[PDB]
Amino acid sequence: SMEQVAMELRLTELTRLLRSVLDQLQDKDPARIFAQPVSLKEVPDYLDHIKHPMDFATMRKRLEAQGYKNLHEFEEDFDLIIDNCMKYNARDTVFYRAAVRLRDQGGVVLRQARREVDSIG
């Protein structure tokens, strides 16, 4: 149907906007701490601690399959990156501190992304 096509075009355009958001958030991680999944070879107990692991590569796979239907779903995954790190790692670590900085800097980006999503529809 033509309605199905229109819905698919809206999803395509949301995907474009989320790719730009994703790029902007990942620039706030210049150490690449959050670039890839925590390795279960290197942290074998990880899944005993963290039930839903997340990282930027995993988000990028979902994004390119048009797997985010709305901004809320995308923000959920971003928040898991931060929140998982802040639980597994202590306050005095480079990891915890990178997460705090990513959260704080990413808040700005996500604030205007929400306005854009609402505005363009």
Side-chain angles (χ1 to χ4, degrees), residues 1-2 4-6 8 11-15 17-40 42-60 62-68 70-110 112-119 121:
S1 75
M2 197 54 226
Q4 288 298 313
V5 168
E8 296 165 353
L11 179 60
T12 298
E13 287 305 298
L14 173 68
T15 308
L17 178 158
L18 295 181
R19 192 176 302 119
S20 165
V21 173
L22 185 59
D23 289 345
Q24 286 179 72
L25 295 174
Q26 187 156 25
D27 288 342
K28 309 315 182 163
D29 175 29
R32 301 193 71 83
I33 289 159
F34 309 101
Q36 293 294 330
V38 172
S39 170
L40 307 170
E42 301 169 358
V43 188
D45 72 0
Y46 192 60
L47 299 179
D48 295 339
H49 290 265
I50 299 306
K51 300 291 155 185
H52 296 103
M54 193 45 53
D55 69 274
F56 287 131
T58 303
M59 297 189 59
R60 193 173 295 280
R62 186 162 165 193
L63 181 65
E64 289 314 324
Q66 306 191 337
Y68 293 116
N70 57 52
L71 178 61
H72 180 72
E73 292 186 345
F74 175 103
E75 293 177 309
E76 284 197 334
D77 273 352
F78 179 66
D79 287 334
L80 280 172
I81 293 176
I82 299 311
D83 290 343
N84 285 349
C85 182
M86 294 174 75
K87 295 169 194 62
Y88 191 86
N89 305 109
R91 235 161 4 256
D92 70 330
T93 63
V94 66
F95 308 109
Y96 187 110
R97 292 162 173 277
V100 165
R101 295 163 59 84
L102 179 61
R103 188 195 65 189
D104 286 350
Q105 297 191 274
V108 181
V109 173
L110 290 168
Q112 200 52 41
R114 164 48 68 199
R115 293 190 69 85
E116 284 170 349
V117 167
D118 290 356
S119 194

